[PDB]
């Protein structure tokens, strides 16, 4: 299947408690491989996956430079946005950026991304054509006119089709024994009496990679779209993921319910029954 590379950066002001903090992380699919933290001691881009440690000292110098520069840029961008919105310096504000690319099984470019959020909501984003911008409000329209005048989209298009793609393919090769694997979910069901009249059936999916998965309950073959409790997919901490889905059932009716698991590491979707 396809693969993605993403970098996520967060800049947070903390008025009266220091200068803004900048954190950046890089992912291939659901595997983190680098980070930078403006508060940390090293002041360096740091490895977080075995397969990136082989990159030489010039990789780390160049990457450290680009991310420290982004850090300074977004620090100034918080000041600019404050001014655009005429917001008070007392407030704590947030600037998030996401960029990266998708490639197919043959490694061809599938999609690029370059987008910003301010205080948790859309600010400006590069459209799929990699030629135009979507601006969320009047402040971002100022930025949009600025970036149109400086041809910023041409530079981001070039990065996304060129360097971003080349890096992803390279990372996919160097970490092939780790990144191109799938781990199928290990599955089971637990049963927890509520009262004398009701019990919870919980359907479990453990140790899977990648994180994408679907768990659904059926009663006599019919979906239980809204009496189902679902938790957010969570990391185990070892590079695999976990999720469960629960349904409240009247005691004696446990056998009418089926749980259904879809994951790309499965050749066929699973059906589980108490």
């Amino acid at each position: 299947g396809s693969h993605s590379m993403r970098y996520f950066s967060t800049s947070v002001s903390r008025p009266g408690r220091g200068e803004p903090r900048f954190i950046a992380v890089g992912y291939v699919d659901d595997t983190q491989f680098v980070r930078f933290d403006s508060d940390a001691a090293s002041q360096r881009m740091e490895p977080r996956a075995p397969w990136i440690e082989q990159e030489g000292p010039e990789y780390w110098d160049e990457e450290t430079g680009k991310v420290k520069a982004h850090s300074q840029t977004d620090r100034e961008n918080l000041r600019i946005a404050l001014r655009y919105y005429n917001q008070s310096e007392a407030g704590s504000h947030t600037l998030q950026m996401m960029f990266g690319c998708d490639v197919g099984s043959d490694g061809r470019f599938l999609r690029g991304y370059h987008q910003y959020a301010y205080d948790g909501k859309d600010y400006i984003a590069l459209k799929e054509d990699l030629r135009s911008w979507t601006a969320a409000d009047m402040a971002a329209q100022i930025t949009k006119r600025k970036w149109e005048a400086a041809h910023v989209a041409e530079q981001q298009r070039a990065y996304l089709e060129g360097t971003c793609v080349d890096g992803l393919r390279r990372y996919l090769e160097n970490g092939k024994e780790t990144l191109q694997r799938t781990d199928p979910p290990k599955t089971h069901m637990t049963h927890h009496p509520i009262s004398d009249h009701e019990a919870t059936l919980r359907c479990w999916a453990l140790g899977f990679y990648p994180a994408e998965i679907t768990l659904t309950w059926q009663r006599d073959g019919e979906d239980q779209t809204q009496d189902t409790e679902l938790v957010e997919t969570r990391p185990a901490g070892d590079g695999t993921f976990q999720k469960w889905a629960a349904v409240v059932v009247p005691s004696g009716e446990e056998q009418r319910y089926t749980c259904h698991v879809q994951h790309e590491g499965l050749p066929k979707p699973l059906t589980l029954r108490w």
Binding site: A90, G91, H93, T94, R234, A236, G237
Partner: peptide
């Protein structure tokens, strides 16, 4: 000094292995 739409964290406590 919160800014933007507030969202309460969703919290899960669990072990890596059974």
């Amino acid at each position: 000094g919160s800014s933007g739409i507030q969202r309460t964290p969703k919290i899960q406590v669990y072990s890596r292995h059974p």
